[PDB]
Each structure stands twice: as structure tokens, then as C-alpha cells.
Amino acid sequence: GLAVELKQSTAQAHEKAEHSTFMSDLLKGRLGVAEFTRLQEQAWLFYTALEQAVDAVRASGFAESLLDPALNRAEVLARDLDKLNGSSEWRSRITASPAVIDYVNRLEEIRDNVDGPALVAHHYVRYLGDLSGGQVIARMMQRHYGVDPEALGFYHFEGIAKLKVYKDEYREKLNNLELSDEQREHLLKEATDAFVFNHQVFADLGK
């Protein structure tokens, strides 16, 4: 089934992402709220772009039940970043890292091509990770850095009650998607590139 083949085909990359120097230092408590904030600011850039692609693919009629607007992160993230930074200053100050310029360009290509299979790959890499390892990250930021839970909206998924059921249902939606051989191959390849872009976001933050 597709959910299983996704998890399998990216499990090695996921292990490598765990061991990125930036993210490893962050989660062991060696950095601080400033570096978590730098990450969130890059993520607001790529989630803005991802959610434009989502919106395009949802409107085309592809994977509609999977692309639940409730998952949208960008506006919650911006509220988090208002709290973390103390003001709206960050909006004119932030710039995309080179890793983010590549990731955003790919998401804009998927948007304008309305490429349903490529979009579902990027949707799985980001949102199932947020829904799945996100508490771990939200707990670490609270424990090591004292980040207020109100600045971790991104991880809360307001509007979802039973989270484990939602995850189960998300993976059943992936399994039930109609895909040709060419579309499934393209989706799997894109999921590998999604992890590659994410890992390079951390590499660039660590510079």
C-alpha cells in the first residue's frame, strides 16, 4: 500500500534528518529560542508556498479529502512568529535561505502545473511529520527553552480532537488514492526530493 511504501522509501532519509547537526543541537537543548525561531521563519516561507500548491491541487479535484484545509499551518505559524519575535517586524526582515529558495521554487512549479501526485508527496512529508513527530518537537521546545505553548500553535492542530484516528484516516486516504504506475513512481521520487529540501533547510540554518 502507498502509505507503507512512502514510509519505507523515506525511512533512511528520515534517520539522516534526525542526525542533522542543526536539528540535533536544537532538540538536545544546545541552541535556544532564537534558533527555533529562525527555523519557524524558514518554515513559514515554505508552508506559505506549499499551501498555495495544496490550494491549486484541491481545486483541481485531486486527493480532495486528503487535503484538509484544517492542516494549513501558515497563518498559525505567523501568529507563533508574532509571539516569538515580539512584533510583526520579522515579516520584512526575513529572507529565504538558499535551501528555501529551491524548495519554494519546486512548490511553485507543482502549483502552476497542478501536479496532484507531486503535491501529495510534499503534503505527506510535511503534514504527516508534523502530526506524528510534532509533539516531540513541541515538548522539547517547552522543556529545553521554556517556549510558551501559545507560541507552538503550529504543533497543536487546532480543530483536530482524536489525533491518532486522524493519522490512521490520513494513511487510509493515501492507500485509497487512484494512481497510475507513472503517477505513483513520480510521487515516490518527489517524496525523496521533499526530504532532501528539508534536510538542506537544516544544513543552511546550521551555517
Active-site annotation, residues = 19, 47, 125-126, 129-130, 134
Please, which of residues 94-133 interact with ligand HEM by CB under 6 A? 124-125, 128-129, 132-133
Please, which of residues 176-205 interact with ligand HEM by CB under 6 A? 195, 198-199
Residue whose entry in the numeric block shows the C-alpha cell 510534532: 134
The binding track of 12-41 with respect to ligand HEM, each residue x by CB under 6 A or -, is --x--xx----x---x--------------
**Is 143 annotated as belonging to a binding site?**
no
Spatial neighbors of 119 by CB under 8 A, at least 6 apart, are 53, 54, 56, 57, 62, 63, 67, 110
Q: Is 23 helix (H, G, I), strand (E, B) or coil?
A: helix
144 interacts with ligand HEM by CB under 6 A = no
**Is 171 annotated as belonging to a binding site?**
yes
Q: Is 191 helix (H, G, I), strand (E, B) or coil?
A: helix
Side-chain half-sphere of 116: how many Cα atoms within 13 Å? 18
DSSP 92: H
**CB 92 → ligand HEM: shortest distance, Å?**
28
Closest CA to 63 of 172, 192, 194: 172
- Binding residues (CB under 6 A) for ligand HEM: these are 6-7, 14, 17-18, 23, 27, 124-125, 128-129, 132-133, 136-137, 195, 198-199
- Known binding-site residues for heme b equal 7, 14, 124, 171
Residues that constitute the known binding site for L-ascorbate: 18
